[PDB]
Amino acid sequence: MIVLFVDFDYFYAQVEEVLNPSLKGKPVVVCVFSGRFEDSGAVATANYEARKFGVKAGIPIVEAKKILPNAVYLPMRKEVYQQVSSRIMNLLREYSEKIEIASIDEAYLDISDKVRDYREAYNLGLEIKNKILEKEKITVTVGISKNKVFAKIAADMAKPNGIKVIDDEEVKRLIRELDIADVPGIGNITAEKLKKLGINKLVDTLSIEFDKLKGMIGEAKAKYLISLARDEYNEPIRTRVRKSIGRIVTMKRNSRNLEEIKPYLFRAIEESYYKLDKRIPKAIHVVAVTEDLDIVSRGRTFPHGISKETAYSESVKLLQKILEEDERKIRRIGVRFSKFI
DNA sequence: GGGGGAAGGATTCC
DNA sequence: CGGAATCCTTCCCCC
Ligand SMILES: Nc1ccn([C@H]2C[C@H](O)[C@@H](COP(=O)(O)OP(=O)(O)OP(=O)(O)O)O2)c(=O)n1
Ligand SMILES: [Ca+2]
Ligand SMILES: [Ca+2]
Ligand SMILES: [Ca+2]
């Protein structure tokens, strides 16, 4: 089995360099402005020029501007990158439509029938890469190996504009020396827990007692890591696609006034519906970040689809429910529709 | 003991 | 001082 992975280099930031090439060679920074008055928000992504001075994804627009006050800060136009994305995905769609669209800028292609041997697999990466760069001037990185996870790791290493193949022997070595931190689906909050239990690499997950792990990193993530350490990992390449659509916003101020929140909630719904389109959702969740930035969401699953009218209808009580079981001040508020039909 | 789901909490950037 | 989703663990009715 040979899986070819593709990941768009600094996607958002880059796309903006396509619609306005004057920025390349310059620090570009895509941002999300909340509006709770100026500079407030976060960073979505930053090109490499920007990254090398400390500007990464996740930092407050203010702390970033202290590093590059002369950098270009563009608000995020997700709808744009989305289209640009779909294009690169449909182009890929046929190099093996036994492909999985992981995210707005990720995909997995099972090139088993379409080819064998890495040599060729590689030569089909520049092929794929070359095409995308030509047809859309976007630089991407490719990963190749026996399974999805490792294919990604190959790409994550040689980025950007890279193409790396890490098959069989190297796999063993990574299972031995790769840093647990760097394992797909292993964020910060999971990496440290993992050090505590004395694990810093994949292989180490075979020395610890299966229970200590479920005990801490959840039976879910637990089985995952072990499976990898035994290079007994294998999950087909099947386009697994979106199972929830929502919209969340920041109230100009924090509060517990039902009639003050209501408007943002009704704006979130309205937009969620529009983005839902023809897809009919059977479950609805009212979400609201507390000021200590926690996440409390009260939902519901009907035995049938939700008409916008109903969305409005239940959204209110789910919201009333929340206030009714928590206490904190709701900073941001929204809704999320799932269980489509 | 466990299927089958709905619900609420946490985590990753999937 | 963001925003979108997913992941995942506990609760629940009941055969
Ligand atoms: N806290 C975060 C983290 C990431 N993203 C966005 C940034 C990108 O728009 C998208 C994909 O980011 P990746 O990390 O997968 O890849 P990058 O876009 O960062 O490029 P690169 O992997 O080459 O660094 O996720 C976000 O909105 N908020
Ligand atoms: Ca990327
Ligand atoms: Ca990515
Ligand atoms: Ca990591």
Cα A7 to ligand 3 centre (Å): 5
| Peptide bond preceding A160 in cis form (omega within 30 of 0) | yes
Nearest CA to ligand 1 atom 16: A10
Residues A91 and A6 grouped into a single domain: yes
Backbone φ, ψ for residue A134 (5° rounding): -70, -65
In this structure, what CATH number is given to the domain that contains residue A222? 1.10.150.20
Residues A103 and A71 grouped into a single domain: no
Residues A131 and A6 grouped into a single domain: yes
Q: Which residues of A283-314 are buried (b: 16+ CB within 10 A; e: fewer)?
A: bbbbbbbbeeeeebbbbbeeeeebeeeebbeb
Interrupted backbone of chain A, residues before each interruption (C–N > 2.5 Å)? none
Residues A115 and A96 grouped into a single domain: yes
Distance CA A176, CA A246 (A): 40
Q: Which of A102, A132, A147 is nearest to A4 (CA)?
A: A147
Enclosing domain of residue A114? 2-10+78-166
Instruction: Choose the final residue of a domain: A150, A166, A182.
Output: A166
Q: Which residues of A116-148 are buried (b: 16+ CB within 10 A; e: fewer)?
A: eebeebbebbeebbeebeeebebbbbbbbbbbb
How many domains does chain A divide into? 4
Residues A6 and A16 grouped into a single domain: no
Does the active-site annotation cover A106?
Answer: yes
- The tokens of A87 are what? 């294009």
For this experimental structure, what is the resolution in angstroms? 2.6
- Residue from A32, A43, A45, A182 whose mutation best tests the ligand 1 pocket (most atoms within 8 A of CB): A45
| β-pairing verdict for A163-165 and A140-145 | parallel
Residues A316 and A178 grouped into a single domain: no
The experimental method is: X-ray
Name the burial class of residue A35, with classes exposed (0-12), middle (13-18) and buried (19+) by CB atoms within 10 angstroms of its CB. exposed
In this structure, what CATH number is given to the domain that contains residue A97? 3.30.70.270
DSSP A114: S
Distance CA A9, CA A150 (A): 18
Distance CA A208, CA A197 (A): 8
